[PDB]
Design a protein around this ligand. Structure first.
Ligand code: QEI
Ligand code: QEI
Ligand code: ZN
Ligand code: ZN
Lengths: 349, 349
């Protein structure tokens, strides 16, 4: 297996489906990444995460760097070994969760330390360290913040490249900034392209703007990124946000872990209407949870504060997301994604 | 399969090993029963409980009767169906957890209502409803309380018998009382024998008396019970308590769910000495947890308050108990239990 190979198998409009091949495994795209925060995907063993169909998980850096510590995890063999997940892991840069000088942020985290921490963890996909642009942001501030991010993007590239085992075995993604402003998004895309990355994230969205504005920014922002590399929309996860985002060119997502997702829309299982409902969470869902337990039981578990309630709810929700991703991939491959998208939200809402 | 058949396969001194056959499955004895409190064994799916080797679980009645409600559980198909465990379930009578007139206790729970609630749950082994004798207790009070329990024992027998589906499909155990007093224990055994039960519990112990006194009471108390029926020691669960209890004639236990059990004694995984320990919880343990994760990881999980920490700790501890039970059964079968018991506690302490 190569360090990194993204291949597009099929397209429909702006949507793409394909694969990212890496040394630890193949990632099917468009891809949803369950999040692990303190080296665990909440309430699930790694084997359960895999069984839902996840190909890659996201590891939060901020928490790991505080506990148990990046050096400690490296001493113990790296994050994959520590937590028992042997497939790819994408690590975030740690900054969002902190988030201040040109060198970085003390709360000490800088482009270089971030990349070092991700190396210590043994991350497969490394995120460049950026500066959080708050929403809303004035043009001047978004610009200043975007420029700083591009300087930090270059520092991230050079830090990554200066570490041979990292350079040979991991991938590096850059993050586009610029708030909602087209010209800033363009300058940002151009800067990142000039530096060169294995993949490109759209940062700065899903922060109060609302879906309409997010989609509008995506409309012009994703075509600015290199077409031949993956496009990652950071911190976007509602099912309808994902479908629309894929319609605009996005290949990767992270964010499911009383709310249960269903094809007819989210339900809150604690609601009294489910107390004697023997149906599964979702009548079409293939997950082991819907195979074996009723709404009534999970309703009881969650109302009683039982851990098994969290376990079941999480497994269902992550499986639901992976099934969504699978339906998206198949429909693009089959050239019926536009219809899928229409059908999905006629029923979802 | 018969409603109930206890067969003793081997003996060594007072210790016995055998089987209880019931319609939902075979219970290997001596047996350890994981406890389910609100229709779940904490942090484990039923399939995981089974994988540890449990043959039967205990369901707490008190909690179920409050939430979600016994009638509701019956409406939904019974406890086995509700929670996804299809093997035998022993239910307690609900009284300990409440615990006042001759009719019962309002907090309304009486012999008859208790037996009814256990029927609604679809319990396989039904516990007679008794009166809690506190420890310590004067002779007069233990006697009064024991007498009341024997009256309630007869009421429990007749309530159970008056319900054909229960009588034909479930078993009924009586509970011996009498605190630490031999003559009261004898009167109690005699009363219960005269009424007749499928099994006999030793109630009233493990309540401050300490292991030495408990063993001393067991010394004279268990031989008073019918030899040919199972002997259940209620609410006794430390590994060393179990070994000593089996040496005295006990066949069933309930009580494992930061403390991890090991063959060298309990450890508290949160202790800083384990933060970089890559060994499993126990180096001889066969459980899936010790197959895959280190002390260091579980230490981190528990210190971080992660649910996966509780999941792993619980699975290990219950597996450890089932392995203990298996070692006990094999050593009795092989006539080397006395040596096993000696070896166990030379290392355990
Ligand atoms: N580091 C990184 N991580 C991330 N997670 C989610 C987002 C998208 N950001 C938006 C979410 C909150 C902030 O106010 C910003 O408006 C992102 C990013 O832009 N960069
Ligand atoms: N109902 C029933 N459940 C039970 N769980 C544990 C015990 C053994 N009891 C002792 C534990 C607490 C009390 O002070 C009593 O000293 C038991 C019982 O004797 N009866
Ligand atoms: Zn499901
Ligand atoms: Zn173990």
């Amino acid at each position: 297996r190569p360090r990194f190979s993204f291949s597009i198998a099929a397209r429909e409009g702006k949507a793409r489906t394909g694969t990212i091949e890496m040394k630890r495994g193949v990632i099917r795209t468009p891809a949803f990444m369950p999040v692990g925060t303190a080296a665990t995907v909440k309430a699930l063993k790694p084997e359960t995460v895999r069984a839902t169909g996840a190909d890659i998980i996201l590891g939060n850096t901020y928490h790991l760097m505080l506990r148990p510590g990046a050096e400690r995890i490296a001493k113990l063999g790296g994050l994959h070994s520590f937590m028992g997940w042997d497939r790819p892991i994408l690590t975030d840069s740690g900054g969002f969760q902190v988030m201040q000088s040109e060198e970085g942020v003390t709360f000490m985290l800088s482009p270089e330390r971030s990349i070092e921490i991700q190396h210590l963890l043994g991350s497969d996909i490394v995120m460049a360290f950026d500066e959080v642009t708050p929403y809303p942001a004035t043009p001047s501030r978004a610009a200043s913040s975007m420029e700083r991010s591009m300087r930090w993007a270059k520092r991230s590239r050079d830090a990554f490249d200066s570490r041979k085992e990292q350079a040979e075995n991991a991938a590096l993604f850059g993050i586009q900034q610029g708030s909602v402003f087209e010209n800033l998004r363009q300058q940002s895309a151009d800067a990142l392209a000039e530096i060169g990355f294995d993949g490109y994230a759209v940062g700065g969205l899903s922060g109060g703007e609302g879906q309409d504005e997010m989609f509008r920014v995506l409309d012009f922002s994703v075509p600015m990124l290199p077409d031949d590399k993956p496009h990652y929309l950071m911190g976007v996860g509602k099912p309808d946000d994902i479908v629309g985002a894929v319609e605009r060119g996005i290949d990767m997502f992270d964010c499911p872990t009383g709310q249960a997702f269903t094809w007819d829309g989210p339900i809150n299982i604690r609601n009294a209407r489910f107390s004697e409902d023997l149906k599964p969470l979702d009548s079409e869902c293939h997950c082991a949870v819907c195979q074996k337990w009723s709404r009534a039981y999970i309703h009881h578990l969650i109302r009683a504060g039982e851990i098994l309630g969290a376990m079941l709810m999480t497994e269902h929700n992550i499986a639901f997301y992976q099934q969504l991703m699978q339906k998206i991939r198949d429909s693009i491959s089959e050239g019926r994604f536009s219809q899928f998208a229409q059908d999905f939200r006629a029923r979802y809402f």
